[PDB]
């Protein structure tokens, strides 16, 4: 509705619609993860080495080939898994039989 | 230096605690009040926490 | 003493169960219905529960 002769004062930054949008987006984000797998079995020491491929200078080193012992369907079984990680997702700690752990464990 | 009133009230216990990593354990040495622990299965130095 | 109609319906299964304590284990056995278990890794005696 055009409201032909109405002049009104607006003030963004003091607008509470922003805060509601903020809270609803974050809430929906969190709700979407409720039924998803929690990767707690993966907070183990890793054994990380370099990638066996043609890596350009811009990628040096950027990726690591990490092996680890993952849990499996049965509690009395364990499996060897390896995967690629970005350097930014791992931290160069541990310093035992192995090299690196996941950033947020 | 424990007064008579406190004899047997505190115990110095050592347990293996979990750690940040699933495959690692640590060794922690803490004081407990006697009322929070219970001795078990005829072992002189073996205790468990009251409500496990 | 199993009648003909029940042959193969029940199995006597042994397993290592957890206990109240993280560092203590117990041997448990129980009877299961055949419909609740599945054979695995080509072993006559090796079974697991259907929903793992």
């Amino acid at each position, epitope marked *: 509705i055009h409201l032909e002769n109405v002049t009104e004062e607006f003030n963004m930054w003091k607008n509470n619609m922003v805060e509601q949008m903020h809270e609803d987006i974050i809430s929906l984000w969190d709700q979407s993860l409720k039924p998803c797998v929690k990767l707690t079995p993966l907070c183990v020491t890793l054994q990380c080495t370099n990638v066996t491929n043609n890596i350009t200078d811009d990628m040096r080193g950027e990726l690591k080939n990490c092996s680890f012992n993952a*849990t499996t369907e049965l509690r009395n079984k364990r499996q060897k898994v390896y995967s690629l990680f970005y350097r930014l997702d791992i931290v160069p700690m541990v310093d035992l039989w192995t090299n690196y752990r996941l950033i947020n464990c | 230096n424990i007064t008579d009133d406190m004899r047997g009230e505190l115990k110095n216990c050592s347990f293996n605690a979990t750690t940040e990593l699933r495959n690692k354990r640590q060794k922690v040495y803490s004081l407990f009040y006697r009322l929070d622990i219970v001795p078990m299965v005829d072992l002189w130095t073996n205790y468990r926490l009251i409500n496990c | 003493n199993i009648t003909d109609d029940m042959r193969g319906e029940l199995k006597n299964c042994s397993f290592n169960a957890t206990t109240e304590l993280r560092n203590k284990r117990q041997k448990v056995y129980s009877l299961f219905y055949r419909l609740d278990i599945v054979p695995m890794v080509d072993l006559w005696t090796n079974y697991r529960l259907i929903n793992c």
Partner: antibody, heavy 132, light 106 residues
Framework: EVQLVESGGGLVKPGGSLRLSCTAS????????MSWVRQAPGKGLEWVGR??????????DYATPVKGRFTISRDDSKDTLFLQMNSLKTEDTAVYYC?????????????????????????WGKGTTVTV | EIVLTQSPGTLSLSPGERATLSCRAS???????FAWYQQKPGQAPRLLIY???SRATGIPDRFSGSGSGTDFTLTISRLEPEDFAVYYC????????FGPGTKVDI
């Protein structure tokens, strides 16, 4: 690759002092107990002493024949072990070695201590000398 | 102090033979505190067996052993070139002393 990098040895006389030390390589020392053993030429192995980590409380243990003149200390923070010698006897020439045990438990699950792969690594340094 | 002695002082066996070594503590020290090393001349000693039972990391399965009070034994099921070294037993009876060293020779 648990290594002990041993250094600081050399030619000394009884009327002096010497400090030998080992520094961690690969695997750290704040989580390990260390000891010294010496072997004079033509002799068997003689334990000098052992010091625990500052965790249990830097407690030391020494063989009777080396007490007082041979003491042991740790830095822990810089991963360095020391054998401190002062006013030695003419009986003290030997190759001294540092050593440590490494007890590593790989647990299969964060819920049940029943399943693990346990490994025990006995690690020795190269050997340095104390002389007469 | 703790005194350990060894026997025979020298072993003379061909590769492929069972080079059994024995040693004795003067003190009765429980087997839980028993260790047996192999020292290649010029090298630091290397633990073979601890707790008079469990095998150390890396150590070949030709090595085994046992013992009780003062009586301890080391078994090499088949002698190999890698075993021609001087062996030492050690007892962690609050003073971790060692025997004089036993030579395995041919």
């Amino acid at each position: 690759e648990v290594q002990l990098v041993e250094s600081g040895g050399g030619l000394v006389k009884p009327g002096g002092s010497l400090r030998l030390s080992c520094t961690a390589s690969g695997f750290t020392f704040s989580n390990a107990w260390m000891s010294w053993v010496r072997q004079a030429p033509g002799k068997g192995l003689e334990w000098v002493g052992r010091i625990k980590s500052k965790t249990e409380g830097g407690t030391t243990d020494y063989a009777t024949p080396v007490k007082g003149r041979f003491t042991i200390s740790r830095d822990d923070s810089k991963d360095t072990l020391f054998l401190q010698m002062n006013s030695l006897k003419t009986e003290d020439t030997a190759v001294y070695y540092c050593n440590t045990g490494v007890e590593t438990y790989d647990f299969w699950s964060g819920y049940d201590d029943h399943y693990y792969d346990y490994y025990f690594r006995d690690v020795w340094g190269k050997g340095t000398t104390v002389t007469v | 102090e703790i005194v350990l002695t060894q026997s025979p002082g020298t072993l003379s066996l061909s590769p492929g033979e069972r080079a059994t070594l024995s040693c004795r503590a003067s003190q009765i020290i429980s087997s839980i505190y028993f260790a047996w090393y192999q020292q290649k001349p010029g090298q630091a000693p290397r633990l073979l067996i601890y707790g008079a039972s469990s095998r150390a990391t890396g150590i070949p399965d030709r090595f085994s052993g046992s013992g009780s009070g003062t009586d301890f034994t080391l078994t090499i099921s088949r002698l190999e070139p890698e075993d021609f070294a001087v062996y030492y037993c050690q007892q962690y009876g609050s003073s971790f002393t060692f025997g004089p060293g036993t030579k395995v020779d041919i």
